[PDB]
Amino acid sequence: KVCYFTSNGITHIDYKDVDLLKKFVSERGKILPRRVTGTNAKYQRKLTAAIKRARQMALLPYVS
Amino acid sequence: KGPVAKRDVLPDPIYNSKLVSRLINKMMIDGKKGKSQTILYKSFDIIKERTGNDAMEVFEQALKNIMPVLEVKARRVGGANYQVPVEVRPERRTTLGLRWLVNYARLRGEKTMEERLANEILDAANNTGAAVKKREDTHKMAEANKAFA
């Protein structure tokens, strides 16, 4: 596929962007892997850091 | 390898049936179709006499009571010795019916196998009888082991 963050040029993912993180997160609550969303390695690292921080502030779920 | 099949002869000069000659070939001891034909026709003449009916329909009713739907085969996995129930294909239904008629008739004990086969058909007609113990018990073994199918 195509990477999101290379396309839209956007850098540090800004945990407040709950809708974008909600796009990358799967239906139950898990982080989708890199071969599903198509991102880079680096951007998947910043994505998973963002999702874990937004989970601990209940901006994102853990289990559904 | 593959499956091989066999044949059988169509008529009987009285009682024109395939399966009655199939019973003639059954219960043949030591290569004597003559004795089994004599036993069979004297038995069916008793079935025509003792009950005022044609013995063809009584004989098919006895078959219908005996023909088993469900054999229970074997399946040993590990140390388990499970028996597995099999839907019987109808050729083996007829032939297990004939074996149970013949075996439990000659196992009964009366003053000819003429009389034993006649009374075993008369018992298997009104279903309660000696071979139908084996029919019921095979269906009970399939009923108990139905968890495997």
Binding site: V63 | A80, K146, A147, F148, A149
Partner: protein, 114 residues
């Protein structure tokens, strides 16, 4: 009552079905061992079907009709038990595939052949 949730927990030994009420109050329960199967037949989906049939009969005896069925535990008889809740006069609307997933937690007991 009319609505409840059917908790099926089918594991490699037993397939236990408890039909409970929505804020968790068990109306009736029956297992694969309650039906009479004592051996390994407890694991077979025929026993899970039978256990769902008896739990469904008890639930209709108390009167509930529309379930919301939660499959729990790794076994074999989950699909037949969902199907047998349908064929016994009930409705299975939602299917909650909820086996208890630890994230990392406690360590499991040792592997078997060692």
């Amino acid at each position: 009552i009319e609505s409840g949730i059917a908790h099926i927990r089918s594991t490699f030994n037993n397939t236990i079905v408890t039909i409970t009420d929505t804020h968790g109050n068990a109306i009736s329960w029956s297992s694969a061992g309650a039906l009479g199967f004592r051996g390994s037949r407890k694991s077979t989906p025929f026993a899970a079907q039978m256990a769902a049939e008896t739990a469904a009969k008890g639930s209709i005896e108390h009167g509930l009709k529309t379930l919301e069925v939660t499959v729990k535990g790794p076994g074999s008889g989950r699909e037949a038990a969902i199907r047998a809740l349908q064929a016994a006069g009930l409705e299975v609307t939602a299917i909650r595939d909820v086996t208890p997933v630890p994230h990392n937690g406690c360590r499991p007991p040792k592997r078997r052949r060692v």
